[PDB]
Amino acid sequence: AEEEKRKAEEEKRKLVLVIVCVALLLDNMLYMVIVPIVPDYIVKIGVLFASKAILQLLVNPLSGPFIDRMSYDVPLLIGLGVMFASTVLFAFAEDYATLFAARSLQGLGSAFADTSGIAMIADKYPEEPERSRALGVALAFISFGSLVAPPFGGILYEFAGKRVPFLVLAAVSLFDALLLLAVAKPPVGTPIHRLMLDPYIAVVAGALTTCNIPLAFLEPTIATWMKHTMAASEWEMGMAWLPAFVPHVLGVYLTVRLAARYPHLQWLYGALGLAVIGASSCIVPACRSFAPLVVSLCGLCFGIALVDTALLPTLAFLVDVRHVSVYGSVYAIADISYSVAYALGPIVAGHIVHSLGFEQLSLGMGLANLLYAPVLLLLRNVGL
Ligand SMILES: O[C@H]1CCCC[C@@H]1N1CCC(c2ccccc2)CC1
């Protein structure tokens, strides 16, 4: 029964991959579906979104050690449990402060669930040409839940309210957590004090910060830019993030296939992604109809797809080779990067586009990414 054992090992491993990708879908669906529905229930709302992400910046440098002290199935149980808590706290509560605590809770739940989920995808796929494939499918479900879910959330919020959508989504969350319990049934690490002084973790964390900063700044800012420049409406600005899903995954496929064909200069096909985000940093403020802004955001999701799918596998490869082979603290560093982007986002984005303008924010993205894109030369001989 050895070959039955190996096949069933592959079945449990693929089931854990699919279940963790669907948990990532549920979490990102929660995030990008509750972004529009909050201002029905009053400055102090940008601080709600950034308090989610800044709470996440609070808990994941602490959660990173608390993830590496334990097999990762239990800190994904914790993550989907507080996902269920936050989601029913959306569905039954309507006050701004319970909404605030639910969004914040979700911040800690993103820390636990997303960090341990990407971490056990990196564990359970130790071989590199299938690690990059599994992290690419993780990115695929994250982009699905972050891009095609605001259309489903719009069509089930201004046609079904918020009680029954978030209770059926809480049902899928609890069922995915209990299915993870049905399929998984659950040494010392590198300190963050020793990861933050490493140059290679620091340049990849700056890469994740800088590639997440346009999706940080634009998402509460694209709406008022539609209103000011393009004169948009309900049906227009809400599904202008949908058509950027299909390039994203396709871009993922490139930096999955090229992970196996030419794995030499992967940092090239990391930094190239950042460079085309710089193309986004040129092409966003000159869009004359719906199609140029759609293809600009397609390029934006395309570039961050390339950057995440080419820099999450080499992040686990970096903590494999240079450090001890645990994956909780290093994707806690990745999620600190994601979190500091989405925490600097909604506080300052709207007020600088009120004050300075929007071309100043696009040229700020240009200055940041074009002062950062040759810093990926620091990974020059790592791929050996
Ligand atoms: O930095 C990455 C690693 C940490 C966890 C998830 C992060 N990443 C964030 C943006 C997300 C995204 C956003 C918009 C469209 C498509 C996809 C892709 C995943």
Numbering used by the authors: 20 to 61, 122 to 265, 277 to 474
Sentences from the paper on this structure:
Subsequently, we determined the cryo-EM structure of the VAChTEM/vesamicol complex at a 3.5 Å resolution by local refinement, which was focused on the transporter portion. In this structure, VAChT adopts a major facilitator superfamily fold in a lumen-facing conformation. On the luminal side, the extracellular gate is largely open. However, importantly, the side chains of Met51 and Glu309 create a barrier in the passageway to the vesicle lumen and partially block the pathway. The additional EM density in the central cavity of VAChT fits well with the structure of D-(+)-vesamicol, whose binding pose was further validated by molecular dynamics (MD) simulations. Vesamicol binds to a negatively charged pocket of VAChT, which can accommodate the positively charged alkylamine group in vesamicol. Notably, Asp398 is directly involved in the electrostatic interaction with the piperidinyl nitrogen of vesamicol. Moreover, the hydroxyl group of the cyclohexanol ring is engaged by Asn302 and Asp398 via hydrogen bonds, further stabilizing the binding of vesamicol. In addition to electrostatic and hydrophilic interactions, vesamicol extensively contacts multiple residues of VAChT through hydrophobic or van der Waals interactions. In addition to its competitive nature, vesamicol may bind and stabilize VAChT in its lumen-facing conformation, thereby arresting the transport cycle; this process is akin to how tetrabenazine inhibits VMAT2.9 In this context, vesamicol functions partially as an allosteric inhibitor.
ACh is synthesized in the cytosol, and its active transport into synaptic vesicles is mediated by vesicular acetylcholine transporter (VAChT or SLC18A3).2 Remarkably, VAChT plays a vital role in ACh neurotransmission. Like other vesicular neurotransmitter transporters, VAChT is a proton antiporter that pumps ACh into synaptic vesicles through the coupled efflux of protons. To assist in the structure determination, we attached a maltose binding protein (MBP) tag to the N-terminus of human VAChT and an MBP-specific binder, a designed ankyrin repeat protein (DARPin), to its C-terminus; this strategy was similar to that reported in our structural study on VMAT2. To investigate the inhibitory mechanism of vesamicol and guide subsequent efforts to develop drugs, we determined the cryo-electron microscopy (cryo-EM) structure of human VAChT in complex with vesamicol or its native substrate ACh.
